[PDB]
Amino acid sequence: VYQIPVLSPSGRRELAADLPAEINPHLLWEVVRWQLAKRRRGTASTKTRGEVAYSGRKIWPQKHTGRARHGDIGAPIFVGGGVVFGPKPRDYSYTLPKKVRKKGLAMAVADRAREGKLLLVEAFAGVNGKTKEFLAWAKEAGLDGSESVLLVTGNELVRRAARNLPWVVTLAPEGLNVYDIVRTERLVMDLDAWEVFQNRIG
Amino acid sequence: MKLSDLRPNPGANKRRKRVGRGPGSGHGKTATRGHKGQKSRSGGLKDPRRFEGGRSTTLMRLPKRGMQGQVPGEIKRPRYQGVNLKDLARFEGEVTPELLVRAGLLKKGYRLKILGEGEAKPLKVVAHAFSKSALEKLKAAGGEPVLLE
Amino acid sequence: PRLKVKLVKSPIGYPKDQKAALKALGLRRLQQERVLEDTPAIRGNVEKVAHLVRVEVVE
Amino acid sequence: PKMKTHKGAKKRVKITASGKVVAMKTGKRHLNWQKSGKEIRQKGRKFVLAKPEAERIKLLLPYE
RNA sequence: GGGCCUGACUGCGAGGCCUGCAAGCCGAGCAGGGGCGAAAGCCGGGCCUAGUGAACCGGUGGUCCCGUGUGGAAGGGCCAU
RNA sequence: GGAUGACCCCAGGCGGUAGGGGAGCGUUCCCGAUGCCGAUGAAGGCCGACCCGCGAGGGCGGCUGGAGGUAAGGGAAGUGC
RNA sequence: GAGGGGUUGUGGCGUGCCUAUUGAAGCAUGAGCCGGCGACUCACGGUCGUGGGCGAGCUUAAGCCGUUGAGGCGGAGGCGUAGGGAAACCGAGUCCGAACAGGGCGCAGCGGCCGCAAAGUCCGCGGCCGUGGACCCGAAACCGGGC
RNA sequence: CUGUUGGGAAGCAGCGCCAGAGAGGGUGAAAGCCCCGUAGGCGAAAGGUGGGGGGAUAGGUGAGGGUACCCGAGUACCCCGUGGUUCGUGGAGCCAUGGGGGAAUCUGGGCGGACCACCGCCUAAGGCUAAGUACUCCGGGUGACCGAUAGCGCACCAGUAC
RNA sequence: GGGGGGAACCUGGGGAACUGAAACAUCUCAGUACCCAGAGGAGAGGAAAGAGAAAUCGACUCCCUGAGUAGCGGCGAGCGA
Ligand SMILES: [Mg+2]
Ligand SMILES: [Mg+2]
Ligand SMILES: [Mg+2]
Ligand SMILES: [Mg+2]
Ligand SMILES: [Mg+2]
Ligand SMILES: [Mg+2]
Ligand SMILES: [Mg+2]
Ligand SMILES: [Mg+2]
Ligand SMILES: [Mg+2]
Ligand SMILES: [Mg+2]
Ligand SMILES: [Mg+2]
Ligand SMILES: [Mg+2]
Ligand SMILES: [Mg+2]
Ligand SMILES: [Mg+2]
Ligand SMILES: [Mg+2]
Ligand SMILES: [Mg+2]
Ligand SMILES: [Mg+2]
Ligand SMILES: [Mg+2]
Ligand SMILES: [Mg+2]
Ligand SMILES: [Mg+2]
Ligand SMILES: [Mg+2]
Ligand SMILES: [Mg+2]
Ligand SMILES: [Mg+2]
Ligand SMILES: [Mg+2]
Ligand SMILES: [Mg+2]
Ligand SMILES: [Mg+2]
Ligand SMILES: [Mg+2]
Ligand SMILES: [Mg+2]
Ligand SMILES: [Mg+2]
Ligand SMILES: [Mg+2]
Ligand SMILES: [Mg+2]
Ligand SMILES: [Mg+2]
Ligand SMILES: [Mg+2]
Ligand SMILES: [Mg+2]
Ligand SMILES: [Mg+2]
Ligand SMILES: [Mg+2]
Ligand SMILES: [Mg+2]
Ligand SMILES: [Mg+2]
Ligand SMILES: [Mg+2]
Ligand SMILES: [Mg+2]
Ligand SMILES: [Mg+2]
Ligand SMILES: [Mg+2]
Ligand SMILES: [Mg+2]
Ligand SMILES: [Mg+2]
Ligand SMILES: [Mg+2]
Ligand SMILES: [Mg+2]
Ligand SMILES: [Mg+2]
Ligand SMILES: [Mg+2]
Ligand SMILES: [Mg+2]
Ligand SMILES: [Mg+2]
Ligand SMILES: [Mg+2]
Ligand SMILES: [Mg+2]
Ligand SMILES: [Mg+2]
Ligand SMILES: [Mg+2]
Ligand SMILES: [Mg+2]
Ligand SMILES: [Mg+2]
Ligand SMILES: [Mg+2]
Ligand SMILES: [Mg+2]
Ligand SMILES: [Mg+2]
Ligand SMILES: [Mg+2]
Ligand SMILES: [Mg+2]
Ligand SMILES: [Mg+2]
Ligand SMILES: [Mg+2]
Ligand SMILES: [Mg+2]
Ligand SMILES: [Mg+2]
Ligand SMILES: [Mg+2]
Ligand SMILES: [Mg+2]
Ligand SMILES: [Mg+2]
Ligand SMILES: [Mg+2]
Ligand SMILES: [Mg+2]
Ligand SMILES: [Mg+2]
Ligand SMILES: [Mg+2]
Ligand SMILES: [Mg+2]
Ligand SMILES: [Mg+2]
Ligand SMILES: [Mg+2]
Ligand SMILES: [Mg+2]
Ligand SMILES: [Mg+2]
Ligand SMILES: [Mg+2]
Ligand SMILES: [Mg+2]
Ligand SMILES: [Mg+2]
Ligand SMILES: [Mg+2]
Ligand SMILES: [Mg+2]
Ligand SMILES: [Mg+2]
Ligand SMILES: [Mg+2]
Ligand SMILES: [Mg+2]
Ligand SMILES: [Mg+2]
Ligand SMILES: [Mg+2]
Ligand SMILES: [Mg+2]
Ligand SMILES: [Mg+2]
Ligand SMILES: [Mg+2]
Ligand SMILES: [Mg+2]
Ligand SMILES: [Mg+2]
Ligand SMILES: [Mg+2]
Ligand SMILES: [Mg+2]
Ligand SMILES: [Mg+2]
Ligand SMILES: [Mg+2]
Ligand SMILES: [Mg+2]
Ligand SMILES: [Mg+2]
Ligand SMILES: [Mg+2]
Ligand SMILES: [Mg+2]
Ligand SMILES: [Mg+2]
Ligand SMILES: [Mg+2]
Ligand SMILES: [Mg+2]
Ligand SMILES: [Mg+2]
Ligand SMILES: [Mg+2]
Ligand SMILES: [Mg+2]
Ligand SMILES: [Mg+2]
Ligand SMILES: [Mg+2]
Ligand SMILES: [Mg+2]
Ligand SMILES: [Mg+2]
Ligand SMILES: [Mg+2]
Ligand SMILES: [Mg+2]
Ligand SMILES: [Mg+2]
Ligand SMILES: [Mg+2]
Ligand SMILES: [Mg+2]
Ligand SMILES: [Mg+2]
Ligand SMILES: [Mg+2]
Ligand SMILES: [Mg+2]
Ligand SMILES: [Mg+2]
Ligand SMILES: [Mg+2]
Ligand SMILES: [Mg+2]
Ligand SMILES: [Mg+2]
Ligand SMILES: [Mg+2]
Ligand SMILES: [Mg+2]
Ligand SMILES: [Mg+2]
Ligand SMILES: [Mg+2]
Ligand SMILES: [Mg+2]
Ligand SMILES: [Mg+2]
Ligand SMILES: [Mg+2]
Ligand SMILES: [Mg+2]
Ligand SMILES: [Mg+2]
Ligand SMILES: [Mg+2]
Ligand SMILES: [Mg+2]
Ligand SMILES: [Mg+2]
Ligand SMILES: [Mg+2]
Ligand SMILES: [Mg+2]
Ligand SMILES: [Mg+2]
Ligand SMILES: [Mg+2]
Ligand SMILES: [Mg+2]
Ligand SMILES: [Mg+2]
Ligand SMILES: [Mg+2]
Ligand SMILES: [Mg+2]
Ligand SMILES: [Mg+2]
Ligand SMILES: [Mg+2]
Ligand SMILES: [Mg+2]
Ligand SMILES: [Mg+2]
Ligand SMILES: [Mg+2]
Ligand SMILES: [Mg+2]
Ligand SMILES: [Mg+2]
Ligand SMILES: [Mg+2]
Ligand SMILES: [Mg+2]
Ligand SMILES: [Mg+2]
Ligand SMILES: [Mg+2]
Ligand SMILES: [Mg+2]
Ligand SMILES: [Mg+2]
Ligand SMILES: [Mg+2]
Ligand SMILES: [Mg+2]
Ligand SMILES: [Mg+2]
Ligand SMILES: [Mg+2]
Ligand SMILES: [Mg+2]
Ligand SMILES: [Mg+2]
Ligand SMILES: [Mg+2]
Ligand SMILES: [Mg+2]
Ligand SMILES: [Mg+2]
Ligand SMILES: [Mg+2]
Ligand SMILES: [Mg+2]
Ligand SMILES: [Mg+2]
Ligand SMILES: [Mg+2]
Ligand SMILES: [Mg+2]
Ligand SMILES: [Mg+2]
Ligand SMILES: [Mg+2]
Ligand SMILES: [Mg+2]
Ligand SMILES: [Mg+2]
Ligand SMILES: [Mg+2]
Ligand SMILES: [Mg+2]
Ligand SMILES: [Mg+2]
Ligand SMILES: [Mg+2]
Ligand SMILES: [Mg+2]
Ligand SMILES: [Mg+2]
Ligand SMILES: [Mg+2]
Ligand SMILES: [Mg+2]
Ligand SMILES: [Mg+2]
Ligand SMILES: [Mg+2]
Ligand SMILES: [Mg+2]
Ligand SMILES: [Mg+2]
Ligand SMILES: [Mg+2]
Ligand SMILES: [Mg+2]
Ligand SMILES: [Mg+2]
Ligand SMILES: [Mg+2]
Ligand SMILES: [Mg+2]
Ligand SMILES: [Mg+2]
Ligand SMILES: [Mg+2]
Ligand SMILES: [Mg+2]
Ligand SMILES: [Mg+2]
Ligand SMILES: [Mg+2]
Ligand SMILES: [Mg+2]
Ligand SMILES: [Mg+2]
Ligand SMILES: [Mg+2]
Ligand SMILES: [Mg+2]
Ligand SMILES: [Mg+2]
Ligand SMILES: [Mg+2]
Ligand SMILES: [Mg+2]
Ligand SMILES: [Mg+2]
Ligand SMILES: [Mg+2]
Ligand SMILES: [Mg+2]
Ligand SMILES: [Mg+2]
Ligand SMILES: [Mg+2]
Ligand SMILES: [Mg+2]
Ligand SMILES: [Mg+2]
Ligand SMILES: [Mg+2]
Ligand SMILES: [Mg+2]
Ligand SMILES: [Mg+2]
Ligand SMILES: [Mg+2]
Ligand SMILES: [Mg+2]
Ligand SMILES: [Mg+2]
Ligand SMILES: [Mg+2]
Ligand SMILES: [Mg+2]
Ligand SMILES: [Mg+2]
Ligand SMILES: [Mg+2]
Ligand SMILES: [Mg+2]
Ligand SMILES: [Mg+2]
Ligand SMILES: [Mg+2]
Ligand SMILES: [Mg+2]
Ligand SMILES: [Mg+2]
Ligand SMILES: [Mg+2]
Ligand SMILES: [Mg+2]
Ligand SMILES: [Mg+2]
Ligand SMILES: [Mg+2]
Ligand SMILES: [Mg+2]
Ligand SMILES: [Mg+2]
Ligand SMILES: [Mg+2]
Ligand SMILES: [Mg+2]
Ligand SMILES: [Mg+2]
Ligand SMILES: [Mg+2]
Ligand SMILES: [Mg+2]
Ligand SMILES: [Mg+2]
Ligand SMILES: [Mg+2]
Ligand SMILES: [Mg+2]
Ligand SMILES: [Mg+2]
Ligand SMILES: [Mg+2]
Ligand SMILES: [Mg+2]
């Protein structure tokens, strides 16, 4: 078990948590790959020599002109003809195994835990919507903006307050994902979100 | 662990074989197809799993055998999938086709039949059929067979 | 699981009904060893003469 | 799209448990009067196809 | 040349020859029931090597295996040709 | 050897078409990047007898050019004539 | 500005490139020259190998919900867990057979319950096969409807 | 905001400030706070829409017993010739129908793959019915989509010149 | 009231061939291309003289699965619920 520092008005707490011990870099890479692959738009397209505007007339006779034999000017050997193996619209998504993405999620959170960069918060004192409020809170909480932070919390007023900062990413715990965990240098969570995370890896 | 640390394990993502791309590569000019003939062609070659240059094929000179059937097709009948005693050891108390399908052992829509590889545990097991050695082993280890339909 | 049952203590001097259990279990010789089922019937006889019997569970 | 089962193979052959291919002996469909019982008897049994030919027909039978 | 006979068997087949495949060839021995022989044994056609034709489609004699709600039937399968 | 490429010593192999295998270079694009290089001059162009790399190539310098370019690490292809 | 760069008088050596071929400098093919365009791909299925997850199990599909470059739910189903037989049927066996015969096809981790490994299966990647126009270009023709 | 280098500051330096807004594009170079925007909010007299919410209207409505009146005709049905189905004449049903013959109204008729019996299923020869589905001339949003031989045939007075 | 138009999409009435079968005729391509008629913002379909074995289900359309299964097939190539 790791020991995760907790932040309370009632004082600097500690709490044991059951993150996995051994971390698999290749596995985390497989989840990030699959994350960034299934979001692809797949909108690259080209025109086959049959999808092109020209007519299928034979531009000149097969024999006895002294020029190369050609068919129609849609053939890809012509400028302005079709393109042989151009992109067609594609679905890059795939069903990465549920167990694997669950494992990576717990793994990526454990890496921040094993580093000292996982803070669990009780609540957010004054922050009720405004950036200046969350900023002030961040100063008390040791978050000065020198490091990037993944804020994971179901409180929307806290999410809107932090989200425009250039060093803060914003998530509801149902949106916890490993790519955003790895993007960031620190990880900050509600005890409400922490409970949610703990349920999703079980 | 930073984004720039995420790399695939050695060999996880090998690069492709790109032919017809110069002398240095080993694959220039003919793109490993050799020279002329069918099969060098785009689209070339009939399906080599079957075709044999025009002679009667290895498959087609073999004789047919057995019932292939006829329209209106398959005759619907009760189907038995057998499950071994060794597969039952994990359970306690009573064993049922329901419980057996959720374990992953029995397939849906298949009447149960207990087979006798392995030993018998004292279990009341409700199955559509038993082998001879399934009944004997079972009803001799405290087991409780239950034929049904 | 089955029952590797070995007779390791002479019945001589013990009540007759315990000597019958050995006959039920088939133990007719010292150090003799029989493998039986774990039937609650068979078990109880083995439990009766537990002090005369070495028992290993098999399977 | 998905491959189609070669029904000539399906009707002529069987893949065993270890992945051999088995077929009926050829040569007793007719013309059998002057054949010994030794020929008629041995040709009534299945046989294992040579490996090169076996691996071909097995690809024709992809969902067995 | 003669006598008695039908092994010109049925159910299998160790092991080989040959061979790209598929075929082709030889085969001891075990069992069933036989032929000949006092017997040892021999006999699964012919001194041997040519006298031949894969599959598909159908015919006929068996078998009683499937039989499209059920019992039958139609029709197939299997064995032989 | 030292200990798993930590580098060193000693030895042998290293012509090559079809073709098999291996390891790299470069191009476009994405993550890295709310970053970093950039008018004290981006990309591209023109030179170089300089440096690195077996090579494909990569640097550096001078001129041109005048607004972009983009690392270590990975990802994807309309990727080299 | 003990070195380099340009030039080339003389001497030595010396049969273009590509393609096709048994064999080309070949008096066999192609190319005036330059720049740009130009040919092994994608989907789905298969089959091997490979990087990981899980392992007698593995995995979801369409959808539903959430996000709006967030991810989750969904077990229907699919593959595997047993084979043999035309089948009925039997089953670690089964089929042929009269057979308890003979044969065909089948049947069973590494270290101290704990740890690793592994059937299998899922996904990624790569080689190759099937279906597609399937490496690119090229017919003479065939058909339909119109001019 | 100021200084600064510079043709120009958004660069560099100094001291600030906003953020439910740090998506993006501009501005003389590289700008959160100059501009246009962005987050978050507001907006229709008129036309269109209105599948949502409300209201009307049409419409909707028992039990026994008796009776045996009615229940879709050149139809079912059979035969000839075909089509559809996975079904290529197959043991060929089923659905459809060009030809011939030609019923019955429930105790009637069709079907469950020749056929027959039993057992079931259904109620032909009248009509209509949202939604879930398809498509992209049109608008908008977004691209590990092109960037002027590319991307539409056309970024440009292009279905033009010719 | 109709007439005519509308990129694709829809239904109906007609309906090829190259090609594949490494020839070709059944078969394939394919009820596709195309022609024609009609319809719309969709269209077709639709309220069991159904399924088909469940003593069951309950209009129709569309998706996933069933399943390349059942079968069809010069039992060839292939086709395919
Ligand atoms: Mg396009
Ligand atoms: Mg194009
Ligand atoms: Mg086309
Ligand atoms: Mg065209
Ligand atoms: Mg065209
Ligand atoms: Mg045109
Ligand atoms: Mg044309
Ligand atoms: Mg034309
Ligand atoms: Mg033409
Ligand atoms: Mg010519
Ligand atoms: Mg010329
Ligand atoms: Mg020319
Ligand atoms: Mg020319
Ligand atoms: Mg020409
Ligand atoms: Mg052409
Ligand atoms: Mg021209
Ligand atoms: Mg064309
Ligand atoms: Mg073009
Ligand atoms: Mg092409
Ligand atoms: Mg092309
Ligand atoms: Mg892929
Ligand atoms: Mg960041
Ligand atoms: Mg932010
Ligand atoms: Mg933000
Ligand atoms: Mg963000
Ligand atoms: Mg958020
Ligand atoms: Mg978000
Ligand atoms: Mg970090
Ligand atoms: Mg390589
Ligand atoms: Mg790749
Ligand atoms: Mg490639
Ligand atoms: Mg090369
Ligand atoms: Mg070269
Ligand atoms: Mg190579
Ligand atoms: Mg080579
Ligand atoms: Mg060449
Ligand atoms: Mg090559
Ligand atoms: Mg090759
Ligand atoms: Mg070749
Ligand atoms: Mg090749
Ligand atoms: Mg060639
Ligand atoms: Mg050659
Ligand atoms: Mg050759
Ligand atoms: Mg060539
Ligand atoms: Mg040749
Ligand atoms: Mg050749
Ligand atoms: Mg050739
Ligand atoms: Mg060749
Ligand atoms: Mg090839
Ligand atoms: Mg070959
Ligand atoms: Mg070639
Ligand atoms: Mg071609
Ligand atoms: Mg082909
Ligand atoms: Mg060809
Ligand atoms: Mg021939
Ligand atoms: Mg079958
Ligand atoms: Mg004693
Ligand atoms: Mg005594
Ligand atoms: Mg005593
Ligand atoms: Mg007593
Ligand atoms: Mg298909
Ligand atoms: Mg066949
Ligand atoms: Mg078979
Ligand atoms: Mg024959
Ligand atoms: Mg026969
Ligand atoms: Mg004959
Ligand atoms: Mg005979
Ligand atoms: Mg003979
Ligand atoms: Mg004989
Ligand atoms: Mg023989
Ligand atoms: Mg026989
Ligand atoms: Mg080989
Ligand atoms: Mg196969
Ligand atoms: Mg296969
Ligand atoms: Mg299957
Ligand atoms: Mg005689
Ligand atoms: Mg006699
Ligand atoms: Mg042999
Ligand atoms: Mg052989
Ligand atoms: Mg011979
Ligand atoms: Mg005998
Ligand atoms: Mg005898
Ligand atoms: Mg005698
Ligand atoms: Mg004797
Ligand atoms: Mg003998
Ligand atoms: Mg044939
Ligand atoms: Mg037959
Ligand atoms: Mg008969
Ligand atoms: Mg019947
Ligand atoms: Mg029967
Ligand atoms: Mg009867
Ligand atoms: Mg019967
Ligand atoms: Mg019969
Ligand atoms: Mg028959
Ligand atoms: Mg018959
Ligand atoms: Mg050396
Ligand atoms: Mg050596
Ligand atoms: Mg070499
Ligand atoms: Mg892009
Ligand atoms: Mg960026
Ligand atoms: Mg700078
Ligand atoms: Mg560029
Ligand atoms: Mg440059
Ligand atoms: Mg250089
Ligand atoms: Mg300079
Ligand atoms: Mg420059
Ligand atoms: Mg700019
Ligand atoms: Mg920039
Ligand atoms: Mg660059
Ligand atoms: Mg870059
Ligand atoms: Mg890199
Ligand atoms: Mg790819
Ligand atoms: Mg290309
Ligand atoms: Mg490459
Ligand atoms: Mg090149
Ligand atoms: Mg000099
Ligand atoms: Mg000189
Ligand atoms: Mg001179
Ligand atoms: Mg000279
Ligand atoms: Mg000379
Ligand atoms: Mg010369
Ligand atoms: Mg050259
Ligand atoms: Mg030539
Ligand atoms: Mg020549
Ligand atoms: Mg020449
Ligand atoms: Mg010449
Ligand atoms: Mg010359
Ligand atoms: Mg010439
Ligand atoms: Mg020539
Ligand atoms: Mg040439
Ligand atoms: Mg010229
Ligand atoms: Mg020219
Ligand atoms: Mg020139
Ligand atoms: Mg050029
Ligand atoms: Mg390839
Ligand atoms: Mg493609
Ligand atoms: Mg596959
Ligand atoms: Mg593969
Ligand atoms: Mg794999
Ligand atoms: Mg897994
Ligand atoms: Mg699961
Ligand atoms: Mg956002
Ligand atoms: Mg079987
Ligand atoms: Mg056996
Ligand atoms: Mg028998
Ligand atoms: Mg036996
Ligand atoms: Mg064996
Ligand atoms: Mg493992
Ligand atoms: Mg694995
Ligand atoms: Mg292959
Ligand atoms: Mg084509
Ligand atoms: Mg195609
Ligand atoms: Mg290919
Ligand atoms: Mg023709
Ligand atoms: Mg003709
Ligand atoms: Mg003609
Ligand atoms: Mg003509
Ligand atoms: Mg014509
Ligand atoms: Mg005409
Ligand atoms: Mg100034
Ligand atoms: Mg200023
Ligand atoms: Mg500057
Ligand atoms: Mg400043
Ligand atoms: Mg924003
Ligand atoms: Mg944007
Ligand atoms: Mg901006
Ligand atoms: Mg801007
Ligand atoms: Mg800047
Ligand atoms: Mg800007
Ligand atoms: Mg700006
Ligand atoms: Mg808004
Ligand atoms: Mg607004
Ligand atoms: Mg509003
Ligand atoms: Mg209402
Ligand atoms: Mg009502
Ligand atoms: Mg009423
Ligand atoms: Mg009626
Ligand atoms: Mg009517
Ligand atoms: Mg009427
Ligand atoms: Mg007639
Ligand atoms: Mg008829
Ligand atoms: Mg028909
Ligand atoms: Mg049909
Ligand atoms: Mg028909
Ligand atoms: Mg029919
Ligand atoms: Mg009629
Ligand atoms: Mg009446
Ligand atoms: Mg009735
Ligand atoms: Mg009636
Ligand atoms: Mg009817
Ligand atoms: Mg009828
Ligand atoms: Mg009937
Ligand atoms: Mg029915
Ligand atoms: Mg029936
Ligand atoms: Mg019905
Ligand atoms: Mg009707
Ligand atoms: Mg309607
Ligand atoms: Mg609708
Ligand atoms: Mg648009
Ligand atoms: Mg727009
Ligand atoms: Mg231009
Ligand atoms: Mg253009
Ligand atoms: Mg330009
Ligand atoms: Mg371009
Ligand atoms: Mg346009
Ligand atoms: Mg336009
Ligand atoms: Mg153009
Ligand atoms: Mg133009
Ligand atoms: Mg014009
Ligand atoms: Mg008109
Ligand atoms: Mg109209
Ligand atoms: Mg039609
Ligand atoms: Mg039509
Ligand atoms: Mg015609
Ligand atoms: Mg034809
Ligand atoms: Mg033809
Ligand atoms: Mg042909
Ligand atoms: Mg051909
Ligand atoms: Mg021909
Ligand atoms: Mg033809
Ligand atoms: Mg035809
Ligand atoms: Mg076609
Ligand atoms: Mg075709
Ligand atoms: Mg057709
Ligand atoms: Mg149509
Ligand atoms: Mg069309
Ligand atoms: Mg609609
Ligand atoms: Mg409608
Ligand atoms: Mg009604
Ligand atoms: Mg009705
Ligand atoms: Mg009803
Ligand atoms: Mg229905
Ligand atoms: Mg009911
Ligand atoms: Mg309903
Ligand atoms: Mg379907
Ligand atoms: Mg299945
Ligand atoms: Mg068919
Ligand atoms: Mg077909
Ligand atoms: Mg058909
Ligand atoms: Mg068809
Ligand atoms: Mg249908």
UniProtKB/Swiss-Prot annotation, chain A:
Annotated GO biological process: translation
The UniProt record lists the keyword Nuclease: no
SUPFAM superfamilies from the UniProt entry: Ribosomal protein L4
GO MF terms held by the record: rRNA binding; structural constituent of ribosome
Coiled coil, from the record: none
NCBIfam families associated with the record: rplD_bact
Name of the featured protein: Large ribosomal subunit protein uL4
From Swiss-Prot, chain B:
Superkingdom assignment: Bacteria
Entry's Gene Ontology BP terms: translation
Molecular function terms from GO: rRNA binding; structural constituent of ribosome
Keywords assigned: Ribonucleoprotein, Ribosomal protein, RNA-binding, rRNA-binding
Start and end residues of each stretch annotated as Disordered: 1-60
Stretches with biased composition (Basic residues): 30-39
Biased composition (Basic and acidic residues): 44-53
GO cellular component, one term: cytosolic large ribosomal subunit
Record bears the keyword rRNA-binding: yes
Subunit-structure text: Part of the 50S ribosomal subunit.
Function (record text): Binds to the 23S rRNA.
Membership in a protein family: Belongs to the universal ribosomal protein uL15 family.
UniProt protein name: Large ribosomal subunit protein uL15
Curated annotation (Swiss-Prot), chain C:
Cited InterPro entries: Ribo_uL30_ferredoxin-like_sf (IPR036919), Ribosomal_uL30_bac-type (IPR005996), Ribosomal_uL30_CS (IPR018038), Ribosomal_uL30_ferredoxin-like (IPR016082)
PROSITE patterns: RIBOSOMAL_L30 (PS00634)
Molecular function in Gene Ontology: structural constituent of ribosome
Pfam families listed in its UniProt record: Ribosomal_L30 (PF00327)
CDD domains linked: Ribosomal_L30
Keyword terms, alphabetized: Ribonucleoprotein, Ribosomal protein
GO cellular component: cytosolic large ribosomal subunit
GO biological process: translation
Family: Belongs to the universal ribosomal protein uL30 family.
PANTHER family in the cross-refs: LARGE RIBOSOMAL SUBUNIT PROTEIN UL30M, MITOCHONDRIAL RIBOSOMAL PROTEIN L30
Subunit structure: Part of the 50S ribosomal subunit.
Protein name: Large ribosomal subunit protein uL30
UniProtKB/Swiss-Prot annotation, chain D:
GO molecular function: structural constituent of ribosome
Pfam families: Ribosomal_L35p (PF01632)
Protein name in UniProt: Large ribosomal subunit protein bL35
Family: Belongs to the bacterial ribosomal protein bL35 family.
UniProt-listed HAMAP family: Ribosomal_bL35
PROSITE patterns in UniProt: RIBOSOMAL_L35
Keyword entries, A-Z: Ribonucleoprotein, Ribosomal protein
GO biological process: translation
SUPFAM superfamilies: L35p-like
